[PDB]
């Protein structure tokens, strides 16, 4: 998802003014990680009886 965003904005943004800080969007990566650890059938609640 982040790669789709970054290669969308490679073209629209002006050359010789950009840097990976301006290109990288970390919100979908952290969103994916948070969506995995919370609300997934494999990220199960730890069973301690």
């Amino acid at each position: 998802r982040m790669e789709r965003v970054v290669r969308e904005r490679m073209t629209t943004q002006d050359v010789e003014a950009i840097t990976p800080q301006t290109l990288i969007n970390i919100r979908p990566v952290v969103a994916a990680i948070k969506e995995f650890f919370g609300t997934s059938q494999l990220s199960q609640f730890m069973d301690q009886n």
């Binding site: 002006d14 003014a17 840097t19 800080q21």
Partner: protein
């Protein structure tokens, strides 16, 4: 033109220190890369010495540049297109180009606007960016301690 240890000025990231004159080859051609680092972005950039003037790595403002951008900032008669969108796109291109005279004109124009009219938080942000890069430029031009560069810049805007 750009020797080692030189406090060389590169757009848009202001002044920067060169660390070494790197002989990193590509395709068996030992191009004369130079490593240059800035203090703000904490990034290192390698630039070949052949096309170093193509990127337009400048030299710092001396004295004539200081009084020139001074005269521009104090230049009267400045007026802008009535539709704010044309003014926005014009001074956006003008800051994206990045020369000290035009950045000075942008910041003094918006300060004259902001004094009475006021602008949006996006337009304030465009100011703040232009002001930040300009005060970095001046504080490494006169080598005069960024806070003192801000206080002198605020001194001069009032004239």
């Amino acid at each position: 033109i750009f020797k080692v240890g030189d406090t060389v000025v590169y757009p848009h990231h202001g002044a920067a220190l060169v660390e070494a004159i790197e002989t990193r080859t590509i395709k068996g051609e030992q191009k004369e890369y130079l490593v240059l680092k800035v203090a703000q972005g904490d990034l290192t950039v390698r630039v070949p010495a052949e096309n170093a003037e193509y990127v337009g790595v400048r030299d710092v403002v001396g004295q004539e540049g200081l009084d020139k951008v001074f005269q521009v900032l104090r230049a009267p008669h400045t007026e802008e297109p009535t539709n704010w969108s044309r003014r926005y796109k014009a001074n956006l291109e003008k800051l994206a180009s990045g020369d000290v005279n035009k950045v000075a004109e942008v910041v003094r124009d918006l300060w004259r606007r902001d004094q009475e009219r006021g602008l949006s938080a996006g337009e304030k942000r465009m100011l703040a960016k232009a002001r930040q890069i300009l005060v970095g430029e001046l504080a490494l031009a006169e080598s005069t301690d960024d806070a003192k560069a801000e206080t002198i810049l605020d001194e001069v805007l009032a004239a």
